[PDB]
Symmetry: none
Subunit: 443 residues, 6 copies
Amino acid sequence: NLWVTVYYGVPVWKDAETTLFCASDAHNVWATHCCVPTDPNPQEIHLENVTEEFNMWKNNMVEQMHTDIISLWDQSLKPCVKLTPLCVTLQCTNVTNNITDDMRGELKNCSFNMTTELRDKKQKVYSLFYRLDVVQINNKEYRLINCNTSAITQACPKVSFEPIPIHYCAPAGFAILKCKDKKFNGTGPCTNVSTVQCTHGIKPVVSTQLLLNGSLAEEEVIIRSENITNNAKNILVQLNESVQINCTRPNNNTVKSIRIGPGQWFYYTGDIIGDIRQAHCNVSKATWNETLGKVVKQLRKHFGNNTIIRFANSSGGDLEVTTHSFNCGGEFFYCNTSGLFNSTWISNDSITLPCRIKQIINMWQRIGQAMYAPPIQGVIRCVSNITGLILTRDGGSTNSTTETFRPGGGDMRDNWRSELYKYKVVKIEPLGVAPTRCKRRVV
Amino acid sequence: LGFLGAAGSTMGAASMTLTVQARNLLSGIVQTHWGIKQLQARVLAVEHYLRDQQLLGIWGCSGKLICCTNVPWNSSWSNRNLSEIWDNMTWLQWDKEISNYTQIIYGLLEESQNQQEKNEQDLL
Amino acid sequence: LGFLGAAGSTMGAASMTLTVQARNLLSTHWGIKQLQARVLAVEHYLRDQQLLGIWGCSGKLICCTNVPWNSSWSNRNLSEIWDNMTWLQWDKEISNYTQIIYGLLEESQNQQEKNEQDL
Amino acid sequence: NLWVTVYYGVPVWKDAETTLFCASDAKHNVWATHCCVPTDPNPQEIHLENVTEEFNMWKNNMVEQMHTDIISLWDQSLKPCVKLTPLCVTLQCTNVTNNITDDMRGELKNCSFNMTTELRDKKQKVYSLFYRLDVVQINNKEYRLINCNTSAITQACPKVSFEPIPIHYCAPAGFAILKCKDKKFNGTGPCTNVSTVQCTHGIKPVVSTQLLLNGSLAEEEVIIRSENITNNAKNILVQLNESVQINCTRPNNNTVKSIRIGPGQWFYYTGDIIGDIRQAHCNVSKATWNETLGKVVKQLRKHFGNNTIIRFANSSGGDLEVTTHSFNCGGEFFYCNTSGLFNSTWISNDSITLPCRIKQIINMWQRIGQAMYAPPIQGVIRCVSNITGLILTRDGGSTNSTTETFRPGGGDMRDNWRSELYKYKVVKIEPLGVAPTRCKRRV
Amino acid sequence: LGFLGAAGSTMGAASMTLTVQARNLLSGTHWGIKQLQARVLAVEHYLRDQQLLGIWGCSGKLICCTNVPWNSSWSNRNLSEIWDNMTWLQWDKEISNYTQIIYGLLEESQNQQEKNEQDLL
Amino acid sequence: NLWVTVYYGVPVWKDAETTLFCASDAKHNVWATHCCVPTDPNPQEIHLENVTEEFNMWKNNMVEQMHTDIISLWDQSLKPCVKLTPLCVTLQCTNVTNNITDDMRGELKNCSFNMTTELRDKKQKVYSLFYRLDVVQINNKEYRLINCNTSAITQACPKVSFEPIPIHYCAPAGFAILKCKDKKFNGTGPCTNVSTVQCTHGIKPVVSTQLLLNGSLAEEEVIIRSENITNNAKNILVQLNESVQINCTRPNNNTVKSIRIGPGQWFYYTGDIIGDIRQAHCNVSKATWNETLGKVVKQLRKHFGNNTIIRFANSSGGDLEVTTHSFNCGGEFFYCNTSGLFNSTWISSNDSITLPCRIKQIINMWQRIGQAMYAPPIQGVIRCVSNITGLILTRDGGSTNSTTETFRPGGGDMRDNWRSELYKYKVVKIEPLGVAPTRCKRRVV
Ligand SMILES: *[C@@H]1O[C@H](CO)[C@@H](O[C@@H]2O[C@H](CO)[C@@H](O[C@@H]3O[C@H](CO[C@H]4O[C@H](CO)[C@@H](O)[C@H](O)[C@@H]4O)[C@@H](O)[C@H](O[C@H]4O[C@H](CO)[C@@H](O)[C@H](O)[C@@H]4O)[C@@H]3O)[C@H](O)[C@H]2NC(C)=O)[C@H](O)[C@H]1NC(C)=O
Ligand SMILES: *[C@@H]1O[C@H](CO)[C@@H](O[C@@H]2O[C@H](CO)[C@@H](O)[C@H](O)[C@H]2NC(C)=O)[C@H](O)[C@H]1NC(C)=O
Ligand SMILES: *[C@@H]1O[C@H](CO)[C@@H](O[C@@H]2O[C@H](CO)[C@@H](O)[C@H](O)[C@H]2NC(C)=O)[C@H](O)[C@H]1NC(C)=O
Ligand SMILES: *[C@@H]1O[C@H](CO)[C@@H](O[C@@H]2O[C@H](CO)[C@@H](O)[C@H](O)[C@H]2NC(C)=O)[C@H](O)[C@H]1NC(C)=O
Ligand SMILES: *[C@@H]1O[C@H](CO)[C@@H](O[C@@H]2O[C@H](CO)[C@@H](O)[C@H](O)[C@H]2NC(C)=O)[C@H](O)[C@H]1NC(C)=O
Ligand SMILES: *[C@@H]1O[C@H](CO)[C@@H](O)[C@H](O)[C@H]1NC(C)=O
Ligand SMILES: *[C@@H]1O[C@H](CO)[C@@H](O)[C@H](O)[C@H]1NC(C)=O
Ligand SMILES: *[C@@H]1O[C@H](CO)[C@@H](O)[C@H](O)[C@H]1NC(C)=O
Ligand SMILES: *[C@@H]1O[C@H](CO)[C@@H](O)[C@H](O)[C@H]1NC(C)=O
Ligand SMILES: *[C@@H]1O[C@H](CO)[C@@H](O)[C@H](O)[C@H]1NC(C)=O
Ligand SMILES: *[C@@H]1O[C@H](CO)[C@@H](O)[C@H](O)[C@H]1NC(C)=O
Ligand SMILES: *[C@@H]1O[C@H](CO)[C@@H](O)[C@H](O)[C@H]1NC(C)=O
Ligand SMILES: *[C@@H]1O[C@H](CO)[C@@H](O)[C@H](O)[C@H]1NC(C)=O
Ligand SMILES: *[C@@H]1O[C@H](CO)[C@@H](O)[C@H](O)[C@H]1NC(C)=O
Ligand SMILES: *[C@@H]1O[C@H](CO)[C@@H](O)[C@H](O)[C@H]1NC(C)=O
Ligand SMILES: *[C@@H]1O[C@H](CO)[C@@H](O)[C@H](O)[C@H]1NC(C)=O
Ligand SMILES: *[C@@H]1O[C@H](CO)[C@@H](O)[C@H](O)[C@H]1NC(C)=O
């Protein structure tokens, strides 16, 4: 009765992994890379009667995100002035004047020899450094902290790294499926799915401990975790309300520069204008307490209402392991959140978090060439929105019904999973067959 | 309707949306080692397009979005009525259901077309 | 005659040189640009071939279609178009009505494809 | 009545920008190495009967590629050459006074410095002669090379030739080159003597400022072309219909010396001179030049009126690259005075010697960045070149006095190639189209 | 037999393997470029053959009769020798100096045929 | 009464060279890193019945990729490694007499210099042992390294393995590889036992001079192949049907020291030697060698006459790269003497022969003037055993018709090493379209 009929242009697809295009809305690094415009605005086709499975922890879009961000970064530093000539013995003293007690020992006044553009001529340099970038050799002799492990390169002062939003676009033959179910927890079937050509804009914001300047959850705190009962996994907490945080490095500065080589310029500090104070960030405690209450009741959904949830500080490690970390106006801040994660939940009033500043940056947890951040003239202040948190369980319980949670942090991929969880990439497969009462006519 | 808007539609309902589905396979007209990555992506799109076109040519369906063949449908693959298949089932569901017979049908279709051309030589 | 040679004559005359024109289409830093150029030529070729397939007459140099000609595009008579105009002039004359036809051709192609299935 | 008929292989086209490739018309030079692709045994030009087409040399894109290609090639060829960072040392210099014609007082200086040998610890005292044009005072005084405060210095490789052998540009598949053969084509607008071709003729990538050497000639009369005739913000290009020869020399007999300054790293220097010191210079017939100007002023009056007076004056000032006639002769770089060529008023041996300067370190392309350095050339240099055209400018600020002074012009290197490229346009071939007919598909 | 298994077989016998041969033609920083160049040229060759069959009106066939007569100046061998004794490798050598001629005979007869058909609708 | 018929999918081809790609089976080995592409299971072959093809191993240009890609990979591997530029300083050296066999004859030197450390203002006195072959006197005497006047020296990365693994070469779509199975094939001419494969078996990229190690053996008999038999300027490639084992040792116990020369830049050096000092050497059974030569001389005579005398001798001279048997054993570079091996006349418990070997650290790899490689010392004692599978020989020529000829070890060209494995393969391009006559005219409706 039935015969095989071949149909081409069949609207079906398979899971697939491909290369994506980066595009943006028309000197930074991002816009000079993601040069493909997102300027036109076609939107999406909702798929009626389509259920599809998503898994944010098994996605590869995040790998492409991670890889390309790092590669872009390296390309941007590639053509900049090297600091090799700076790996010399430094003679340093302490800073005792015009400084508060809390800052004593943080800064050092160093003096050293440097070359000039002529090979047989040298100059003395006087500059001020943070102790985090300088170690003792054993007034005392010091060296820069990374001259024993890797080359140090100065980032170009005219290159902006501002994380403008970027969009990813499918290559022809592929499509991006998007889950818009407000209750989606990161895995499994989603029944409200639309198809798009490009993702919405995502800002490639880099941070530790807290998730800044991302999307908010819709009407609830959503906690997404690959393995809920496994303390080896972190959890991503998405808030439906932002929390405002005001950060600054309040002291005024000077920026000086010298020529070391043939058009090779180096930037450094000199003096602090006014006195010396600690960098810090301000959050109202009222909003912080409200935020935690929302998070805590959400956590209890997996532990029981009667569970006591305690917060505590980081377990230990380097600054990129234990502190909050972000770029504010081009500067690199490390903030102590131990006084933030200090409550226990049992069934303006601001908080100031002290912060440290560091100029030699080991990015991506990749030991290799270090980046040097030249100083910024003036006083830096910025305001950011906290949109989520990275936390961990201690685990190792005795079923006490009480558990302490710690700020997490670690991998950077997680910073993008929080935005990319909604997207899936598939390959279109237009060819297929089906039965029909139609025999080919043979002549 | 729109591209892939027919994905949740029944197989029958979706049979009339094939032109958009086919046209957009070549939509990538308008659009460092980065350039190399994208260059390969373009090459792959071409390679996929061509393997499907060659196969339709092999089966004698080069001029058709929809072609009847002389390979009978085998009820052992899916012993279900035509009415369910076209009016209730969607193409996504259908494809999953017959995903383990693809290697059979391609072989049957290749030889069936070869047989017809060979048989034509007795006319010529 | 010569490739692009017929451009000096009428639309009608040029109909026998279509295979001339159809023949040359497939004729460390630096090589990147050259390889991309080769890719683009292929993409343009394939697009046009796909469109002819979309519009039914995939194998013809010339095909009549089932889309009627509109006087709103051109109301000039054939006795003047085919004999007095060149293809360049013609293309310039109807340059607004391209993107619409491409769509009309699917409409006038797929209906008969359906009315071939019920055999 | 009428139906749409689809045609494929239709002989029509559209203006386009695509990438062209180069070919060499039949042995270490850069041009031959790069344009390794052979040219056709003979291109054919197909005339198009009954056509008119519009060309515009100032809106061309072929020139942009030529510019890009020449810079790319230039740099790629210099990438593997010896870097001369070791020369940026304090120099001890005095004037050369023996056997010097008074016109050459100053100019050369006798410098001495301590150069690094292939071993790091050993140094040599090296003596050499440099032109003052490449050397500045630091303040038997201390001196440095002019570019040690700006950029890297690279020695151009002595084994690499830059002879501007003519290169042909060829269309990629799907594209064609149109050529304008009209005798009077002024660089813009409709052209009726139109033909098509696969490739252009060979164009010699000759580089010069002010006066154009070894280019094409006008076929009937001197023709002057400009983007905007009445706008003094634009230059004018004069294509002569007859060539004028210019004889250029560097009379001093140079002895080349060299030193190994690294592991197979060789530096070449000027050594000393055999015989008396004389200045470089160029010879042009006066009568020939005067006749040439006559031919030019006749064309200029076509735009300005019978009653006008055309005066010529010298350049306005600036870098040697713009104030002098900058060109390569025998591998050496000449910066010749041209005031003697532009000192006359036209109202409605018999030769001139132009003095020339020689400069070794060059900021080619008007780029700020690394500068090439010519190696010294052994012996005495002589060449004879053909003057084929000029770059000129209007004075501007006219009071309608009927007298106008023209000044030597100059400009971007692209303008030197527009001189050939005004004859060409590139288009894309578009084989599909439709037309009406009394023919319905036989459905 | 399998891909190229028919290479030593006679011309007639070899007509039975035309689709294995067809399928295996298509279903395939300095390093990456060498690979891409190979892939691109394979496509270009593929397309030329398809284009040419299209030019001749043979795109829908593995084998097509044409309107161009066979010449004794190319081969004066018996039809039975050609199909029953000879192989395609031998044959290709035998007529290797005429293929470039034949191609344009096919082009013209196809153009005349399409024109004749156009005149009838 | 016949018509032209066009046929597509015709199983024919044209000879052609194209780009080949590599693959390998089955962890910092450079070969594996590059040939990351997997191989498939072995059923990639069809025998071609009724096909005779002409092969020519010396006109086979796939070997050119072997001698291009191998070079490229080598340089790619060294590209990111530590530069030794800062070490080109005046050295002050003396001899060593401590527990040394007399026959070292000053091979090693006790030498020191002022090295620049990671802080630019500091020096470190460094003491180490050097081979005489790496060091040239300037004139505690002053010396410099041999290559500081010619090129940069780069230290090879100690974490990268260079052990050759079999590499398979695979055809791109549209191409196929024709394999000759004729056991008597002499490198050229028609072959009737021809099969087609899409990818070859793997060949280890072993690099050596004079003697060919770890290759394939001939079946049944020794086969001698050359481009022009009576032209004494050609290399003779001898493929043995039995291997000969050779035991190569660098017997002294070693210490490897390292110093930081820059910001994460480490240099490795020799320290001192544990125990007394002995010469490097290789051991070959004399009888096995003598039997091997007997097989070879019979095969040589069949092309020169069977009334001749075959003589073996060492090379005429040149640098170590051509006068010695050059090879990599355990990562170390050996330059072994062969004059006592090639010392014979043939006229119509093991008793092995020990050959002395020299060791070098500064290497002019590929006999290419350009960047030099520095081989860091290897901790411990090295011993390896290799399979001698063939020879490279040349003749003196200059015949006086004395029915006597002298054969000497040849070498230098590396392509010739791979030809010994590649002679069985040819690459062709498929041409599926063609025409033939028929009784059928196109039917026109
Ligand atoms: C989370 O998201 C918020 C925004 O929603 C980000 O906040 C922005 O941060 C950047 C960087 O610190 C701010 O940019 C700076 O603004 C200064 C103030 O602007 C003056 O000038 C403008 C005109 O351009 C006036 O309209 C305005 O009233 C002020 O008078 C500038 O002075 C700064 O200039 C410096 O950088 C530029 C490079 O762009 C150089 O060219 C200058 O010479 C100079 O060095 C700079 O432009 C921005 O204003 C903030 N936006 C808002 C709304 O506050 C957070 O940073 C982000 N958080 C994270 C973690 O990503
Ligand atoms: C720059 O280098 C010079 C040496 O060239 C240092 O000067 C020496 O300092 C020590 C310690 O005070 C004295 O004992 C020496 O006599 C000084 N030598 C000379 C030539 O002056 C100088 O201190 C270094 N300066 C900096 C800022 O590092
Ligand atoms: C999604 O499924 C619904 C049914 O759940 C489809 O609704 C049908 O719509 C047609 C046209 O209006 C009616 O004739 C049918 O009677 C409706 N079905 C039922 C059960 O009432 C809807 O069209 C589907 N969407 C898509 C894109 O196919
Ligand atoms: C290889 O060649 C032999 C002939 O030498 C082929 O054998 C013939 O096969 C046909 C099959 O139709 C028989 O009718 C003939 O009688 C056979 N000839 C003889 C002398 O016995 C063989 O088939 C060829 N094989 C391949 C793969 O081409
Ligand atoms: C080459 O090395 C091998 C070891 O890999 C030697 O083989 C051994 O020889 C001894 C006799 O001296 C036997 O007792 C062992 O059983 C053999 N071992 C193996 C694995 O076969 C071989 O003799 C050496 N050849 C030369 C010339 O030195
Ligand atoms: C400088 O400050 C640090 C931190 O307070 C302290 O450890 C160190 O001893 C101080 N050194 C001097 C100069 O007293
Ligand atoms: C955030 O979630 C809480 C808990 O579901 C809800 O009470 C609150 O109104 C939500 N806030 C917003 C802005 O939607
Ligand atoms: C938590 O709050 C108590 C209030 O008495 C304070 O003593 C303690 O130091 C705080 N802990 C942290 C980490 O800030
Ligand atoms: C149908 O399927 C059965 C096995 O279920 C198999 O034996 C038979 O050969 C198949 N027929 C066709 C035409 O595929
Ligand atoms: C398929 O067959 C069953 C059993 O006869 C029947 O109930 C069902 O309605 C048929 N399917 C459709 C879609 O009609
Ligand atoms: C076309 O129309 C013109 C009037 O503009 C008329 O002169 C000419 O004969 C017409 N051609 C025909 C016969 O269709
Ligand atoms: C070389 O160095 C010495 C330092 O002892 C200095 O006096 C001399 O002037 C230098 N020579 C030159 C030519 O610069
Ligand atoms: C032009 O000539 C005058 C007179 O000799 C001179 O003063 C002026 O500097 C010259 N300008 C240039 C650019 O040569
Ligand atoms: C060092 O050894 C060499 C042999 O390699 C010898 O010629 C030289 O005289 C020896 N020098 C001393 C000081 O023993
Ligand atoms: C380092 O240089 C000094 C120069 O005063 C010399 O005496 C010393 O021996 C050198 N060190 C070495 C290891 O050669
Ligand atoms: C090697 O060749 C010789 C002579 O050709 C023969 O006697 C011997 O048996 C062969 N050995 C093997 C393993 O085939
Ligand atoms: C091969 O060598 C012989 C002897 O050297 C010579 O006569 C001959 O010309 C060479 N070439 C050939 C194969 O003819």
